[PDB]
Design a binder for these strands. Structure first.
Ligand SMILES: N[C@@H](Cc1c[nH]c2ccccc12)C(=O)O
Ligand SMILES: N[C@@H](Cc1c[nH]c2ccccc12)C(=O)O
Ligand SMILES: N[C@@H](Cc1c[nH]c2ccccc12)C(=O)O
Ligand SMILES: N[C@@H](Cc1c[nH]c2ccccc12)C(=O)O
Lengths: 104, 104, 104, 104
DNA sequence: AGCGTACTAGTACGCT
DNA sequence: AGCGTACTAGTACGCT
């Protein structure tokens, strides 16, 4: 939400800035300053939502439990598992297969 | 927005789920799959908000422009600059001083 | 609003000046002069904002009403409840659990 | 600032709530939870402003330096010393004289 | 359906 | 005079 422009016009300024973040975080990891950087850059709520999403993504690829079970284990809405499910469908083959290795 | 509990109870699990994210992303960067991973894990809006926060944090450390100017440059609400400002106050000395190197 | 520095520089002096306040107020309570001391030391507006914050913090721990409700009851902006909410998230376990005793 | 009503009407709700704070802090001091309580209740900026005010009040009573000097030592505006000066004028005799003991 | 929370809008006010 | 920041207004959006 950033006053939703859907405008091809400047959805561009708010991407090169995102890449600047991606790069800075990159250095942070290398200097071991990623944790405080992520504490500075994300809110507590964002960090938690992210915790849940990795579990969802992991378990989905794992496929050892129905989505209804996953939702119970995590205390999540089913909508949130579907978001992971559809996103995963769109992820590149490379990413999906690398995830099934590290995450499994 | 996950049933806000402040609950000493399990803010640890979701916290441990969050650390699982931190580690995975760590690997992603190392394997050069961070970009799609972050495209899979965050929504377009989160990516953008993050772009703006790096700018805010950078310009605040830089301290060459008032916050009223920063707000006009970024098209942000003053409240968002204050969140960065207060957060920065809370950041570790280590982090603030490294940011002022890479980010300046 | 005192020349926001984040400056490792002297955030200790002003911090040590702040601790001088904490100790003086301590004495005030013990001698029953806290009320005028607090009338001397804070402005009318700070006292009032503080009244609203205790309510927010109390009601959030209590967790019996939604934040939309809290906001109407108190005539506050939602942003002010979120500040309380996030602040509470960061409070030590000792504090949150004692608050839930005296404040509930 | 709380949308400035000057209205004798409800400047009252936003006083009994303030007394609730004064009382809660009281307990906090007794149980040694005043520090985290004050970290939860005040913003960083409020704590710092408070450090400066105690110094101002102490030094004014002390009267060993002109106000122009005080201002330099503290890096304060002269307006801020005048607020202290005028407030001190209005403080009860009891308070002023107790201050001159503990603070001097 | 409801709820928590980050955000752009634009104020007041304590400070230097 | 200028500046930092807490606030009421009311949005969007991720969540359960
Ligand atoms: N940790 C910050 C995250 C944040 C939100 N908005 C920001 C703007 C700038 C920098 C950081 C932030 C917070 O919880 O408030
Ligand atoms: N890219 C995903 C991000 C996401 C949101 N919720 C999720 C839950 C699980 C995994 C990913 C997500 C999206 O925009 O929808
Ligand atoms: N420490 C809190 C102080 C605060 C501001 N607004 C609040 C509302 C409720 C409770 C605490 C607060 C902060 O800096 O944000
Ligand atoms: N009661 C004082 C609070 C105050 C503001 N600035 C100060 C400076 C010094 C001492 C007290 C103060 C007032 O409303 O003005």
């Amino acid at each position: 939400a950033q006053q939703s422009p859907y405008s091809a016009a400047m959805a561009e300024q708010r991407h090169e800035e995102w890449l600047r973040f991606v790069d800075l975080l990159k250095n942070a990891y290398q200097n071991d300053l990623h944790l405080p950087l992520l504490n500075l850059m994300l809110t507590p709520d964002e960090r938690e939502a992210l915790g849940t999403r990795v579990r969802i993504v992991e378990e989905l690829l794992r496929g050892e439990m129905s989505q209804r079970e996953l939702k119970n284990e995590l205390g999540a809405g089913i909508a949130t598992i579907t978001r992971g499910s559809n996103s995963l469908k769109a992820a590149p083959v490379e990413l999906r297969q690398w995830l099934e290795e590290v995450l499994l």
